Amino acid sequence: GISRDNWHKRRKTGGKRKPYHKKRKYELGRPAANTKIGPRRIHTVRVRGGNKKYRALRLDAGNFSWGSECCTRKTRIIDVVYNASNNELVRTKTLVKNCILLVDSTPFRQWFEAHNALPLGRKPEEEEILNKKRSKKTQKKYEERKKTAKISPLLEEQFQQGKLLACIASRPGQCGRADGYVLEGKELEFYLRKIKAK
Amino acid sequence: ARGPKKHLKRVAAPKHWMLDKLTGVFAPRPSTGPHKLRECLPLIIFLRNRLKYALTGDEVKKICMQRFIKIDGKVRTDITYPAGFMDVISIEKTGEHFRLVYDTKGRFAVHRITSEEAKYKLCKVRKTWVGTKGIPHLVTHDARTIRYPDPLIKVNDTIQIDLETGKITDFIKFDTGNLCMVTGGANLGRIGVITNRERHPGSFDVVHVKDANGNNFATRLSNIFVIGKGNKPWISLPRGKGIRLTIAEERDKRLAAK
Amino acid sequence: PVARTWVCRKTYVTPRRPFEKSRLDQELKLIGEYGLRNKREVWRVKFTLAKIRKAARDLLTLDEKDPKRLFEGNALLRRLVRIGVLDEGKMKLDYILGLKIEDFLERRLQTQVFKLGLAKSIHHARVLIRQRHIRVRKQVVNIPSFIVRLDSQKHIDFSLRSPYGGGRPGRVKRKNAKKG
RNA sequence: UACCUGGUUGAUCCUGCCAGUAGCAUAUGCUUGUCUCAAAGAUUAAGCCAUGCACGUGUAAGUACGCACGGAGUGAAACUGCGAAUGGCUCAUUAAAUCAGUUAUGGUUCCUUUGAUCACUUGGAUAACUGUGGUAAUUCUAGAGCUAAUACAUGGCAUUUAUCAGUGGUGACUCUAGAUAACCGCCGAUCGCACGCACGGCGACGAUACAUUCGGAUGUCUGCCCUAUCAACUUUCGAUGGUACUUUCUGCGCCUACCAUGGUGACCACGGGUAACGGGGAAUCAGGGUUCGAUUCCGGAGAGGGAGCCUGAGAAACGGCUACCACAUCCAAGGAAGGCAGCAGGCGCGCAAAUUACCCACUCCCGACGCGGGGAGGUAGUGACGAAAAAUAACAAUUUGGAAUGAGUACACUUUAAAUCCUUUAACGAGGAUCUAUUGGAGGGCAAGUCUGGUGCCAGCAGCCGCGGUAAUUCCAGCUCCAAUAGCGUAUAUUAAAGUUGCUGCAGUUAAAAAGCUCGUAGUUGGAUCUUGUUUACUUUGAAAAAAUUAGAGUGUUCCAAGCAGGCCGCCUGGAUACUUCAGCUAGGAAUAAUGG
RNA sequence: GACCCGCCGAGCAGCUUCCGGGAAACCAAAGUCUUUGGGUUCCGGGGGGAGUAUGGUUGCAAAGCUGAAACUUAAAGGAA
RNA sequence: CCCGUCGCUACUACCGAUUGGAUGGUUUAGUGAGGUCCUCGGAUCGGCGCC
């Protein structure tokens, strides 16, 4: 099958090398995962040494983290928007490492309101609890949080659309998980300019 | 070539085993264990070739299977157990206790010890790591993992454990002025006082050892096994501790004893 | 893979000039003088001494106080004075080069049992040894090329089972006795 | 032992080769009494294979309702577990590849061993077994009836990212730990013994985020023969580098996408050849070398040719599968089964290479294991590959005599798993001691006949020069002599000889030879000078360089080649040392030769 | 300036010598060479086959440059 | 003493029409068994129409 050896290439000088042995098993290669967006389908691959690799064939949810704050919630992957490798994987919606995609921005806003007591993606009985009644000693705790609860202008306009720019830091084809971090700061301004031109 | 090798030729056997040629084609391959293949003495060779307690490999198995032999206090029934350096071979049936220590020729000599001894053994620390929940661990030269060691014990010192409990009783720090037995070839079995340690970053640290008679010689840090604090060894040394008489001096001592 | 050695060695060297009359008469002079079988035994003793002189040549080129010359030099001298070839008065490597082929031929077993009066001739000696009559300190030695050393020279005698020694006479004497 | 001799001429001194000479290793010829060892279908065919065998495995401790044997137990069979990835064989491929030294994984995976760490006694299937069957045929299997589990299934860490701080570290962590936000296997339904006080001891088995061992995998530095009638090569479709993945046990154009246009080479790239596996080594050698290394040790590779996989810790496995290719077997013609470069054996190929033997007793290996298995191995048979020891007479009288013995032979012992052999030893066994030593030579080189008979430039001899044309010292023979000797010739390759391949160390006026001449890059080599009275090269020291082989210490294997054992009247001694180029590492020297301020 | 008498450097040569070398003829270099090493390029390996075959390259051509093997031979040759 | 042509016999390579022939190795472009992976497929049978 697929071989990851280095004796099938040429030499540094440019000359070809003749193989002295056939293809070995410790230098094999396996087909790509091609992790699409959809219901969770994982295939465990027994690898060298009796270990197991989890090859994600399609994933819809991912454990993404927020950089500025400390909020790591399992959100839903919506759609990919940019890829540094090639524009063909975003056309097929393939989940790979360092792939910019839109994630469900509900858990990140739900935590922001339940912790800082301030509307984030606002332009219902659940929002009535946001203005909860409690002791004044507890209210003073949430009052000092609002003095440092100001979010970046580039992120507040993304909570309105319910979609946050994220970046996959894991390897779906190796561990079967599409975890990552929320794209923000200077990294966001870079990819927003790339998607805008594209 | 497809996996692990399970045989060992007599010509490829370690030289310090002192195996002949015309007895057989294969040599006893020591099973996996605390000590390396090239740096051990399998139990079949020690009972048959050294102690002459058995004449064939089958007679060796008749002794080990009766649970008469204890390496470091624990009974071993495998006739190919490594049983390397500093290991205690106690035989309660004959009331004999041994401790494998090299001689001036670099070979495991028959070193009989006392019943007051054979309860402890010296071990050289090779790796120190911090396990889970902030628990420091230890790696001796015979694959003995020790939890909660003294914080002063480092990656080259020598500890003293008790064969009944496996707990560290005492330890000897590695510094200039302590005894050591070289265990790395061309000085294997020589005992002297450490005098200088050359530190080579990214390479092997070369130390300089001086015998009791004044003979100086250098070796590598991985071959040093601290024996005692100062010049008093914490173990019983065999005849000819580490002097390594020259070929001219060994001839004189040979014919003078006639 | 077998439990064998295959470690052999030739104990002689054929001379370069095959038909030189100066050497052919010299070697034959040593065969008749010491009762040898052929020229190979002459070339054998010649090859042993040629290896001893080469060992002394390698040591004499070294320094006088070289540890290899002092150790292997005394070991070479001890083995020469042990077999009676070299004298105890000459314990220096310079006298090894002065040795000759006859010094080693005089130390062979058939030469000793002839000088000790056990045999009437040097050719009677080889047949006397090959017929299991000569013993060395309670060991029946059957090889005429048995190089006798000093401590084994005073113990050469007839075997305890020889008709010449204290033993039953041979089959010829026993058959000629039962006739008459 | 740092060695030469014949041959060109009428003669001479030369150049020079031919031939002689001595090892070696294959074949072969003749001959061959004993004994210690011992190579042995590699060379041409990695050609093809009848048949037999070479991998199997059970403890008090996974599963025992086969009376199969039995007062529970002992067991077939079978399930489960493990091994079958080692060994053995071959040298086809392969020329910076393999391999060797060095070394890196802080870029990794590792069954096992070792030390750490750790009740609702549940559910329903199945083999053996019972029974019914099919096919010409297979170690083919179908259907039904049962019944077990250490089989199957049920009943805070680890795993994946993000943030913060800086317990033990290293020359150097994005290290080991810790604290947060989350994300989403492991935490014992097992077995034996001992039986004591609801609690209890000793084990077996089993878990791995760990260590450890056996080691894999891929890198670092340096090192390979011949070839220029191979001078430029690589780069579509990766060549070189960058970025992000994907993939793998991980690093890496390993792969993909987007960019960059690189990378290599007269210091010989690329291409071609190798009757090329590499090395440890072997032969031959004053020094220097030349040649060899299929071949018992290490590493690699392959199992007719490729390719693709299963299982497993480990295989791109072939005494495992699935294809195609080559070849070939049984058929009832529907189908089925094949891989000897495993041990013997057979065919073929050839100049060229052995028994279809015996045992697991030794050496070790595997397995549940003290108990089983092993064409691994050992043993014997064949064996003038080769190496060691060593008979074929000795003595005395004058041709004649008594002595002495091994060959041979056996009552037996010993030897060994059982034997054989050797050794030990009764009996017996030598005068033509017929118990018969041959193999090549007798012109020279080259040790040995002006001998006799025959042949008559014939037949033949002759490595070379030559001999033979009727008295041949050379041929065919008798006699005699010489050389080595249980060995001695022949053919071929190879080494010394060859200072006739040259570094040591040759030659080029006329013997073979200096370009017609000059310029010129690389290459090679370069004045003197700096303390006398940074970068390297070099030298010295230490570590390393696996054993076996070689050198060599000790030791009466009867001696010896060998072996590593063996002394002493339990007892004390060995199982040394030296060498291992080059590169790399280390510590001194600072002349010589470069380089820098 | 011409000539005469010397010296120095450069060069074409000559001769006498037992400098030494060489197989010798001969050579002040063809010496300093078994007492063998200043530096460096090209080049020879018995005589034939043969500067032939083939391949490449150069040229309008003639030919130049590079350049074998099978096979054959015990001499070919130098100086005297 | 000796050279060459010619003639005779033998041997060895050389040139040579024959789109000569036979193997081996690199490959361009087609066809492509077999396994693996992925996307589907759901013959079947176990539990409670769904799993």
mmCIF file of N, CA, C and O in Angstrom, chain C residues 62-85:
data_model
loop_
_atom_site.group_PDB
_atom_site.id
_atom_site.type_symbol
_atom_site.label_atom_id
_atom_site.label_comp_id
_atom_site.label_asym_id
_atom_site.label_seq_id
_atom_site.Cartn_x
_atom_site.Cartn_y
_atom_site.Cartn_z
ATOM 1 N N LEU C 62 63.078 -3.478 20.386
ATOM 2 C CA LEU C 62 62.425 -2.619 21.358
ATOM 3 C C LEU C 62 63.456 -1.987 22.290
ATOM 4 O O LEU C 62 64.647 -2.306 22.255
ATOM 5 N N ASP C 63 62.980 -1.075 23.132
ATOM 6 C CA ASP C 63 63.847 -0.445 24.114
ATOM 7 C C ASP C 63 64.260 -1.458 25.180
ATOM 8 O O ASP C 63 63.587 -2.465 25.414
ATOM 9 N N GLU C 64 65.391 -1.176 25.831
ATOM 10 C CA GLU C 64 65.945 -2.121 26.795
ATOM 11 C C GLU C 64 65.032 -2.310 28.001
ATOM 12 O O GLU C 64 64.960 -3.414 28.552
ATOM 13 N N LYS C 65 64.328 -1.259 28.422
ATOM 14 C CA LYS C 65 63.440 -1.322 29.577
ATOM 15 C C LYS C 65 61.969 -1.326 29.169
ATOM 16 O O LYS C 65 61.107 -0.869 29.925
ATOM 17 N N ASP C 66 61.669 -1.841 27.985
ATOM 18 C CA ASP C 66 60.287 -1.905 27.528
ATOM 19 C C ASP C 66 59.541 -2.988 28.301
ATOM 20 O O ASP C 66 60.059 -4.099 28.455
ATOM 21 N N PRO C 67 58.335 -2.706 28.803
ATOM 22 C CA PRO C 67 57.617 -3.725 29.586
ATOM 23 C C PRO C 67 57.255 -4.963 28.786
ATOM 24 O O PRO C 67 57.159 -6.054 29.363
ATOM 25 N N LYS C 68 57.047 -4.833 27.475
ATOM 26 C CA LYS C 68 56.755 -6.008 26.661
ATOM 27 C C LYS C 68 58.005 -6.848 26.440
ATOM 28 O O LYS C 68 57.937 -8.081 26.421
ATOM 29 N N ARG C 69 59.159 -6.196 26.274
ATOM 30 C CA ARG C 69 60.407 -6.932 26.107
ATOM 31 C C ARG C 69 60.822 -7.632 27.395
ATOM 32 O O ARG C 69 61.386 -8.730 27.346
ATOM 33 N N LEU C 70 60.551 -7.021 28.549
ATOM 34 C CA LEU C 70 60.962 -7.626 29.811
ATOM 35 C C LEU C 70 60.089 -8.823 30.166
ATOM 36 O O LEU C 70 60.585 -9.819 30.707
ATOM 37 N N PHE C 71 58.791 -8.751 29.871
ATOM 38 C CA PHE C 71 57.893 -9.846 30.224
ATOM 39 C C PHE C 71 58.017 -11.004 29.241
ATOM 40 O O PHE C 71 58.355 -12.128 29.629
ATOM 41 N N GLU C 72 57.742 -10.748 27.961
ATOM 42 C CA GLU C 72 57.830 -11.805 26.960
ATOM 43 C C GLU C 72 59.263 -12.250 26.712
ATOM 44 O O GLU C 72 59.474 -13.346 26.184
ATOM 45 N N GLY C 73 60.248 -11.430 27.078
ATOM 46 C CA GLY C 73 61.631 -11.859 26.954
ATOM 47 C C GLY C 73 61.993 -12.926 27.969
ATOM 48 O O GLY C 73 62.596 -13.945 27.626
ATOM 49 N N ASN C 74 61.623 -12.707 29.232
ATOM 50 C CA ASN C 74 61.891 -13.707 30.260
ATOM 51 C C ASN C 74 61.080 -14.972 30.022
ATOM 52 O O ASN C 74 61.567 -16.082 30.264
ATOM 53 N N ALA C 75 59.840 -14.826 29.550
ATOM 54 C CA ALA C 75 59.021 -15.996 29.254
ATOM 55 C C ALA C 75 59.633 -16.826 28.136
ATOM 56 O O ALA C 75 59.593 -18.062 28.175
ATOM 57 N N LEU C 76 60.206 -16.166 27.129
ATOM 58 C CA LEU C 76 60.872 -16.893 26.054
ATOM 59 C C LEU C 76 62.153 -17.552 26.549
ATOM 60 O O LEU C 76 62.487 -18.666 26.129
ATOM 61 N N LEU C 77 62.880 -16.882 27.444
ATOM 62 C CA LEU C 77 64.113 -17.452 27.974
ATOM 63 C C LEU C 77 63.828 -18.618 28.913
ATOM 64 O O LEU C 77 64.577 -19.600 28.935
ATOM 65 N N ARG C 78 62.753 -18.527 29.700
ATOM 66 C CA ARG C 78 62.428 -19.605 30.629
ATOM 67 C C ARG C 78 62.065 -20.885 29.888
ATOM 68 O O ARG C 78 62.464 -21.979 30.301
ATOM 69 N N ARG C 79 61.309 -20.773 28.793
ATOM 70 C CA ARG C 79 60.927 -21.965 28.046
ATOM 71 C C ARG C 79 62.115 -22.577 27.316
ATOM 72 O O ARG C 79 62.121 -23.783 27.051
ATOM 73 N N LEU C 80 63.123 -21.769 26.983
ATOM 74 C CA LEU C 80 64.315 -22.306 26.339
ATOM 75 C C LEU C 80 65.221 -23.014 27.339
ATOM 76 O O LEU C 80 65.771 -24.078 27.035
ATOM 77 N N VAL C 81 65.388 -22.443 28.533
ATOM 78 C CA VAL C 81 66.208 -23.094 29.549
ATOM 79 C C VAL C 81 65.474 -24.244 30.223
ATOM 80 O O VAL C 81 66.118 -25.103 30.836
ATOM 81 N N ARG C 82 64.144 -24.286 30.128
ATOM 82 C CA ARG C 82 63.398 -25.389 30.723
ATOM 83 C C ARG C 82 63.616 -26.677 29.941
ATOM 84 O O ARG C 82 63.860 -27.737 30.526
ATOM 85 N N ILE C 83 63.542 -26.599 28.608
ATOM 86 C CA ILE C 83 63.725 -27.778 27.764
ATOM 87 C C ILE C 83 65.186 -28.134 27.556
ATOM 88 O O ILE C 83 65.480 -29.091 26.829
ATOM 89 N N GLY C 84 66.111 -27.397 28.166
ATOM 90 C CA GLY C 84 67.520 -27.713 28.076
ATOM 91 C C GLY C 84 68.232 -27.179 26.855
ATOM 92 O O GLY C 84 69.426 -27.452 26.690
ATOM 93 N N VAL C 85 67.545 -26.428 25.994
ATOM 94 C CA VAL C 85 68.193 -25.884 24.804
ATOM 95 C C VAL C 85 69.148 -24.761 25.186
ATOM 96 O O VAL C 85 70.316 -24.750 24.782
#
